[PDB]
Amino acid sequence: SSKFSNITIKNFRNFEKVNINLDNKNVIFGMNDIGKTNFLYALRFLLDKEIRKFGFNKSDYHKHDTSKKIEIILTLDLSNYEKDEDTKKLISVVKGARTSANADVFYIALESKYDDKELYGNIILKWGSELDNLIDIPGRGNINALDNVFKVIYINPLVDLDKLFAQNKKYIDEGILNNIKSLTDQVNQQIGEKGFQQEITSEYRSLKKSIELKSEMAIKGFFSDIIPYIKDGRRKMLSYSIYNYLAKKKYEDKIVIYLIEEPEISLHRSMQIALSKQLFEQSTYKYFFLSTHSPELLYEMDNTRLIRVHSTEKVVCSSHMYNVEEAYGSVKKKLNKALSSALFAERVLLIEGPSEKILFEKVLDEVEPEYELNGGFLLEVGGTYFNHYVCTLNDLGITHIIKTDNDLKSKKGKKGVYELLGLNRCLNLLGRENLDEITIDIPEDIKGKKKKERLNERKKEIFKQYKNEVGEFLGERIYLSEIDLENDLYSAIGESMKRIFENEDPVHYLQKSKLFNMVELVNNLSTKDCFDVFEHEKFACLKELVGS
Amino acid sequence: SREQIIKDGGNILVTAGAGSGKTTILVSKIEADLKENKTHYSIAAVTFTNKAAKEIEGRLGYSSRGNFIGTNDGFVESEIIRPFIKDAFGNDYPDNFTAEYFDNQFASYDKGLQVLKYQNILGTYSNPKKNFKFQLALDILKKSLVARQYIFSKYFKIFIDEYQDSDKDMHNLFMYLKDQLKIKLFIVGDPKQSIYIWRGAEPENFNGLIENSTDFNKYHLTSNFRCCQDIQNYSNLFNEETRSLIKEKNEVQNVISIADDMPISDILLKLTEEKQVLNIEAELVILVRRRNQAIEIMKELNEEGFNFIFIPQTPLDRATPNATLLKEVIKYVKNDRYSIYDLAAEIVGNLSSREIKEIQKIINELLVPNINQVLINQVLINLFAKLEITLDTREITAFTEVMMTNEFDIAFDTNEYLHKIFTVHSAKGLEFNQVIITASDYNVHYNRDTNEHYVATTRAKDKLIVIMDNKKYSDYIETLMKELKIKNIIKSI
């Protein structure tokens, strides 16, 4: 359902052989800053006439090897031709280069072979329906048929608004203009109305065989300079405001593709969210490619493809089609802001709530305070299932770790029925179906602390029944507690928790106020306590997060 | 009226007549739709002759929309047949084919495919009523999916000129684009049988659309659209059918009547200097019935300093099927600056460079001087034999007579003169800015010369000057002004 299928880059700079799936809206990010920039340049060379005329240098070839040929192919999908207007744009120019047998697909390729004597390898653009017999894109002079289809707008991080406005002023009443024109000449008559015009001529005439020297603008009219005025960081957003209005009117007849590199540069965090809303929520930017290091620039992300360039020197690329389902729509904004910062990390530990974050932040601080520097990240997920977070992180090649409590949820409208919520979420990551809800018989005289302890006994009983299902969880880096985190914490530092709280049952007291008591616990936690919790088998997720 | 015509954005069927009303409205309708539509879709205008396509392209201006302006044959060739013939029929068929109109006539559609597949040329059908190129183009569209996708993606509306000359195979393709591909069609044609038809013309397909088509929106064009309202009122009052369309105006200024009391040259000086109702810098032309009446007026004005050149009606100036083409052959023979490409542009279809060289060889026999009447007739038959057009006996003698003498040279001269005098039959076609006529020429009581008078009145564009030589002429005006209760229809000096 997207015109842009995938792009292939062969032997171009650090790209040995890289295949990346695509969509209308694409966002690229990762550690390799060189790979992200070369990715945008590889798209410009294929589609931007100004950057393509310069040809390939020796450095652009992969590993500076001129024998290997540079090849950049863009695969397109024309299946939605019946209801896509921009698809008909491409068809009208391609004409007979398509075949009816493969009418759904169309290829746009860039081939380059290097000449030693000419010290210069030219760029030959081919297209066609079949990848085997691509034909040269027809052209006459400095323009070809491809330049009539696609117009590439590259938004530099740093831009002067007055300079770009001078480019758009020309194309963007008459009886009124005539009065302004005659009045413009009225300026020059009053300016001359005098001692300098006559003395510079007497000096010029003796020097060289009328020197009036009027004033600019009045010669060419008021339209020559019409720079804007509002009523550094603020004017950057007005340049985007010009781009939206300009490109639609100027390039309505062709497909416009935006290449936005690092737009968060010299931009406030609040404006980054404003730009993110305009990129995804608004239909103003139909097709763009975005390179960003800013998590706040993805707060409003939806219906986009996320491309992650790996930190390795091989320049491996992992792409994910990020789409928020309608069921998650009521918590979409909360979910995106938490996941946006996790895309840039290397290992993400899925925790439930803030009480786990308060504990883990203190424990990690004593054991390994540089865990975020090396790519670790604590992502808290509350109320929702793990599938949306795991699918996005898995496709992007990000190591995901899950630590959740074994919980039971009472079904509404019926008493005595409890859903196996803790197991179902871990089973959902493995693709298995939700387990049947169970009914446990608790007497009416058993309430409060006595009631909770009996429910814990069912959790331990349920945990033992699915002993093999837990075995599959550990292979998938899923860590399901027997009862909950507080009981696993008691197993690691029971002597410390009893001394810290002086209460004979520290687990019961910790769960009274989970946030406050966890803060009270971490304040009195010893350094050996943090190492004991870290080294304990029940907390293997902390060892997997640091990556030892 | 015309404002109601251009506003319609759907399928438009236009009935055009009297000439030039079709071309000006077509160019204005095209450039107006280009301004309204900002999307990537383009328009396509098709004309039978290459001159009409070049005439439309010059008035439109820049075609940065990718709009196609060309010949009917060149359209289906460059947009349908050549791009998608290999998709429709396989890789066996060539896309570098060369279409020759005169050579390689065949009997069956299967035979022509072999000429294109093996002999690498696109030949015409032997039957004039059946078109092979349009039968091939329609067949290619049905066979090729990409061909249908490209036509829909490229053009949103198609303009067609002189639709009454379109054959049935040519008509089937246009209806296929409207019915199946849902492409808007702007159709311009003449419902009257007239004199000029393309060799495979069938007026019934055009007439059938006027009668039974619910999709098209029918419109009509005024015959004297270019003439001003005052001249239209004076012209339409002489014929009963035309008296109903004109509407009275409170003030009449364009039509001037002056009784001829002073000599002819003095009336010209009186209108030019004493009242200044005629400008000497604007083109002025005078109407006569016979050649002798023009000679005596031309000679009388040479004595008074007035300089004039008089165009006489040629033997070819006659309503015949090949009159228009025969005159162009004379213009190529008489004038050296008239190129052979200008002559080929008048020929129907987009002739190839090789076919142009063969036609040029036949006509080069007429460029030698003093080769008598017999050889002119054979060159003419040889010329029209290639075009598969028979020639009327009187058309041959009319062509021959013009070739012998230099008497009718300026009538076919490429140069243009400001002040002229023409006969009513001399410029039955072309229109002039300001015209002066005399009343004694036309018998108005018995309507013998009312048709020649109506033509005389419709030639003037801005200002018409009538001399009231005949009392019976003025009586017919005053009598009908009382029947219609018209106080003023004429401005008298």
CSV table of N, CA and C in Angstrom, one decimal, chain A residues 48 86 113 162 172 263 316 428:
chain,number,residue,atom,x,y,z
A,48,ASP,N,18.4,13.7,-6.9
A,48,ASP,CA,18.6,15.1,-6.8
A,48,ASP,C,19.6,15.4,-8.0
A,86,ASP,N,-0.5,10.2,-6.9
A,86,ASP,CA,0.9,10.3,-7.2
A,86,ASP,C,1.5,9.1,-8.0
A,113,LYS,N,30.3,3.0,-13.3
A,113,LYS,CA,31.6,2.3,-13.5
A,113,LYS,C,32.7,3.4,-13.7
A,162,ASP,N,15.8,34.4,5.0
A,162,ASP,CA,15.8,35.4,4.0
A,162,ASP,C,16.4,35.0,2.7
A,172,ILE,N,5.5,33.0,-6.0
A,172,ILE,CA,4.4,33.1,-5.0
A,172,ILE,C,3.4,34.3,-5.5
A,263,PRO,N,17.1,17.8,12.2
A,263,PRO,CA,16.4,19.1,12.3
A,263,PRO,C,16.3,19.6,13.8
A,316,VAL,N,25.3,-2.4,9.1
A,316,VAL,CA,24.1,-3.2,9.0
A,316,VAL,C,22.8,-2.4,9.3
A,428,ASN,N,2.1,-14.1,25.4
A,428,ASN,CA,1.8,-13.4,24.2
A,428,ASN,C,3.0,-13.0,23.4
